[PDB]
């Protein structure tokens, strides 16, 4: 039961190993997977943010939604043209859907997705070795203008096509420490703007409660022996390694993986015709090739 309703889904904060300041950080754009299987060099990237959707979750091109860094954590939106992809130089963006980008990239040893300028300007870099790919038996930097038109496989630029699915689960607790206030020998739960918050404390025993205003905890003297987190968070989140799972980790939903690998035709170069010299029981081929070109011989006996 794969769904396309993104109002039931929310973005999340990942743990990027290489941020703008060259150290791992929590990021609204975290690179989960990179696939490079198309024959035209295009790559598909999974990002913790959702693209092509607005703040509310409806389909809105030129808007992408992400997770804020504030203590009253909520979902923000921004315009799409400040999303940049790079490997060694800039990458052309071919398409975008929620959690997924499709780009055309030069060869490089890493993949970087960045939000340029404005608020939340950041970047995420992952060690991903991608190289130039080939279709035929002749190398080429660029597709030739005159060729053979052989069958190859490329990523579909249409986002409606699907390559599979990803599972979507209910989110676990996040446990912001700013919800806790330390007083003169006691602690208080301090929910933001009246939103309801569940606390679990280990004062002298395990105590769990739900509050909506600032609430004293009787048995606890330090903030580090109790936690509190937002309640009523029924927004499906991708099964990512950077998030503590819920108590019920059943597959709540499924989301399409866009840009499926599709057959098509594409040209390959035709090399210079060799000159053949004949001598008794042998031939001599005079070979001319600017690029590396594969030659195969076999006897017919």
């Amino acid at each position: 039961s794969i769904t396309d309703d993104f109002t039931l889904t929310s973005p999340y904060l990942g743990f990027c190993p290489y941020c703008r300041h060259s150290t791992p950080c929590f990021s609204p754009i975290k690179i989960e997977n990179v696939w490079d299987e198309s024959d035209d060099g295009s790559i598909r990237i999974q990002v913790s943010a959702q693209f092509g959707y607005n703040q509310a979750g409806t389909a809105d091109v030129t808007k992408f939604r992400y997770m804020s860094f504030d203590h009253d954590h909520d979902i923000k939106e921004d315009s799409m043209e400040k999303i940049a992809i790079s490997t060694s130089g800039p990458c052309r963006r071919l398409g975008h859907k929620g959690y997924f980008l499709l780009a055309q990239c030069p060869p490089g040893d890493s993949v970087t997705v960045s939000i340029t300028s404005g608020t939340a300007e950041n970047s995420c870099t992952v060690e991903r070795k991608i190289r130039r790919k080939f279709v035929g038996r002749e190398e080429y930097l660029l597709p030739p203008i005159h060729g053979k038109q052989v069958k190859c496989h490329v990523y579909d630029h249409l986002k409606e096509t699907s390559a599979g699915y990803i599972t979507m689960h209910r989110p676990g607790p996040h446990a912001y420490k700013s919800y806790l206030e330390e007083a003169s020998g006691e602690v208080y739960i301090k929910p933001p703007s009246g939103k309801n918050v569940t606390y679990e404390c280990k004062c002298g025993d395990y105590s769990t409660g739900i509050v909506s205003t600032r609430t004293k905890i009787n048995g606890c003297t330090k903030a580090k022996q109790c936690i509190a987190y937002k309640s009523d968070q029924t927004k499906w989140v991708f099964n990512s390694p950077d998030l503590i799972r819920h108590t019920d980790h059943s597959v709540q939903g499924k989301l399409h993986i866009p840009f499926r690998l599709t057959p098509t035709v594409c040209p390959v170069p035709l090399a210079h015709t060799p000159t053949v010299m004949k001598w008794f029981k042998g031939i001599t081929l005079h070979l001319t090739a600017t690029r590396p070109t594969l030659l195969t011989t076999r006897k017919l006996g």
């Binding site: 904060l13 929590f26 997977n33 696939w35 299987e37 860094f69 203590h71 954590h73 496989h153 390559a163 599979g164 689960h169 676990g172 607790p173 996040h174 446990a175 912001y176 420490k177 700013s178 806790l180 679990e200 404390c201 280990k202 580090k224 022996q225 109790c226 936690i227 987190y229 099964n239 990512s240 390694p241 998030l243 503590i244 799972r245 980790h249 993986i257 499926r260 690998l261 057959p263």
Partner: protein, 96 residues
Amino acid sequence: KFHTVIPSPQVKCCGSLECKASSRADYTCRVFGGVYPFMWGGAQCFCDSENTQLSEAYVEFAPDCTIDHAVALKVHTAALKVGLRIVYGNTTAHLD
């Protein structure tokens, strides 16, 4: 090419955790005690140093295996079938 699925970690705050057998492909499991996990926001458990973390890992098929995949076969004795053109007198017949 397999795709390695790392699920969301399980964290139980000073209570013991263990994991059972699974039918998933290459299911590898390990539990670590005495952790103190952190996320964006602060600490993740109310309990000091007896916190435990259960980490899961398995593999499945990549989304692009519908095109780039290999099939393993065991083949038996092969039979030869030929297409013959037979011209007898001035009558021509094509057959297999």
